[PDB]
Point group: D3
Chain length 72, copies 6
């Protein structure tokens, strides 16, 4: 489960986009689950090797790209 | 699948997120698909128990979180 | 894989949103995955049969739209 | 999640098959998981709205079909 | 949505198994969905690019193979 | 990626049933996807925390159980 499964992070005006080794998704996404709104995550969606993630109120897409790039 | 399978509903600049009792996500998702552009629901995608819905042009997030929150 | 399966393609101030025929999302979502960050594809999370895709920093939602419509 | 989201229950010589209402698969799926091997469930895989469920190993399919049937 | 997508069809003494060009999985799945109990299918479950489909009793998996092939 | 994501492995007559830590479902089935009829995995449909894999012709569920065990 080592996060070498992570193949790319990125973020725009709306959401943070982590891409993964074919089949990570739900594992890498299960991880971000620990962060919650308090740690800057409003929600999270997985899908194939694509995971979105829009920041909670009080955090910016960047605030997010940061503390997440942090838990990685 | 009582609305009460909905653990929460918050939003942000881009999307209105719902969080469900494990596995209910898509059942609630199927409910949103009943509204569509009609009610300013341009699109909606479910994951684990995290919904990601987004407003139609001429609609805002508060408007969404106002009409989904009204459906529940 | 004929793109008549794509019921809708439309957008908002946040992501392009394609509506496909029952169960076509995961397929159509394969094409959008081909474009990559090179064409402004920041991400594409598929779902039931609704596809959420968003613009790589540098492009606009409105500029990804016209583009999908094109590589479609 | 009232068990009227199920539409039918059947079984052949290898799995119990629950065909449910749109997008309810995950939930009813969510229920059977509480009856691990001990009550006869070696495994269960949910879907679109169909559910495969197979017997532990001391329970014929018929054994499982019944237990399930009782469980709802 | 052309049946050029179906990359494989063989069966064992339990379920028939369709293999595809990744993605179709779901689309392909939903077509079989037209056969029903009556045409010999008790159910179907799919995902990535594999479709499992088991015969309704009174049908031998062999008898399903010839029926799915009679769609495909 | 590590195989300590597999929470158990059992089987019977039809399909082998491998469980896993939350999310791990998909990833682990990958290793599997790299088995082929050659080794005896006729197909593997997995989802959530259960991977069902079935044996190809000429391989007992036990013999395939074997396969996963060595490959695992």
């Amino acid at each position: 489960p080592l996060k070498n499964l992570v193949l790319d992070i990125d973020y725009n005006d709306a959401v943070v986009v982590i891409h993964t080794s074919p089949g990570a998704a739900q594992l890498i996404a299960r991880l971000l689950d620990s962060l919650g709104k308090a740690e800057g995550i409003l929600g999270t969606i997985a899908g194939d090797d694509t995971i979105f993630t829009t920041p909670a109120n009080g955090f910016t897409v960047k605030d997010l790209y940061e503390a997440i790039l942090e838990l990685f």
